[PDB]
Amino acid sequence: MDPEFMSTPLPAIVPAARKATAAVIFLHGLGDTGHGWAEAFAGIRSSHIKYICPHAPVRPVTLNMNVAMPSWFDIIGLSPDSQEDESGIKQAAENIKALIDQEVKNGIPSNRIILGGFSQGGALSLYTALTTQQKLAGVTALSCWLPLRASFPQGPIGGANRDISILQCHGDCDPLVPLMFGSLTVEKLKTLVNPANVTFKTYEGMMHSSCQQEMMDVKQFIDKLLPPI
Ligand SMILES: [Br-]
Ligand SMILES: [Br-]
Ligand SMILES: [Br-]
Ligand SMILES: [Br-]
Ligand SMILES: [Br-]
Ligand SMILES: [Br-]
Ligand SMILES: [Br-]
Ligand SMILES: [Br-]
Ligand SMILES: [Br-]
Ligand SMILES: [Br-]
Ligand SMILES: [Br-]
Ligand SMILES: [Br-]
Ligand SMILES: [Br-]
Ligand SMILES: [Br-]
Ligand SMILES: [Br-]
Ligand SMILES: [Br-]
Ligand SMILES: [Br-]
Ligand SMILES: [Br-]
Ligand SMILES: [Br-]
Predict the structure, then answer these.
(1) What CA–CA distance (Å, rounded) separates 11 from 54?
(2) Could you tell me which residues carry N6-acetyllysine?
(3) 169 FRET partner, CA 20 to 30 A, in 62, 200, 210, 222?
């Protein structure tokens, strides 16, 4: 994981109670933190899964009037039209692939790893899973979008994650990332990957955040795809 990406602390971690036979790598969004997500995932933790919430390098963010904060990549705007930080997204994807590889070198195979995240961290989880040849168990993409959408095929993507399971979650009251982004993303994902394994859930009254019912759907998705043994 490259130089900007090892400026941060080691990830916030929820350990497995038993020995860990699977992992969830969960990427936060602008503002929310690795720590905050680790406390959320503690509430749904499985005895054999380790939950890894890495920290993003601290860098000015254009959307936030150039204030320096943890950020996987720059965000310029959140309209469907907005220009995107292509090079930063690709760079961040290579670091996330490196992070998956660190779990693989520690004994947990990539097909026992779910990658997920919130807002630009969910966008990055989708981008990363659809562009890596590491086979992953699934993706949880919460209140987000598919970055660099026009760079993707108009049909199936093929390669290792062509049949990956994806749960995409969105709030119906999100004032930052419009529900339309979630919708247009699930549409695009049903052409990129096998649509049998793509599920879209929306939450009434949820804004740009998670909620308890969403965390229960995320738990059921993770647990079913990463069962014991
Ligand atoms: Br540390
Ligand atoms: Br562990
Ligand atoms: Br282990
Ligand atoms: Br937080
Ligand atoms: Br890291
Ligand atoms: Br952070
Ligand atoms: Br565009
Ligand atoms: Br974001
Ligand atoms: Br693009
Ligand atoms: Br399948
Ligand atoms: Br509201
Ligand atoms: Br609102
Ligand atoms: Br599924
Ligand atoms: Br669906
Ligand atoms: Br929340
Ligand atoms: Br709820
Ligand atoms: Br599901
Ligand atoms: Br197990
Ligand atoms: Br069980």
Answers:
(1) 4
(2) 224
(3) 62
Distances (CA, A) of 228 to 14, 19, 23, 43, 126: 17, 11, 12, 19, 25
Resolution of the experimentally solved model in angstroms: 1.5
Helices (H), the chain: 34-42, 86-105, 120-129, 179-192, 212-225
Q: Domain limits at 154?
A: 1-229
Q: Residue 141 Cα, ligand 11 centroid: separation in angstroms? A: 21
**Torsion angle defined by CA atoms of residues 45, 183, 122 and 174, in that order, rounded to the nearest 10 degrees:** -80
| 198 φ, ψ (degrees, to nearest 5) | -110, 125
Distance from residue 148's CA to the centre of ligand 14 (Å): 22
Ligand nearest to the CA of 17: 2
For residue 176, the one-letter residue type is: L
Place of tokens 């936030």: 64
How many Å apart are CA 152 and CA 144, to the nearest integer? 17
Sign of CA dihedral 37, 39, 44, 45: positive
Please give the distance of CA 217 from its chain centroid, rounded to a whole number: 15
Nearest to 30 by CA among 9, 1, 56, 3: 56
Experimental method: X-ray
Q: Which residues are catalytic?
A: 119, 174, 208
Instruction: Report the separation in Å between the CA atom of 175 and the middle of ligand 12, taken as the mean of its atom positions.
Output: 5
Quick check: helix, strand or coil at residue 125?
helix
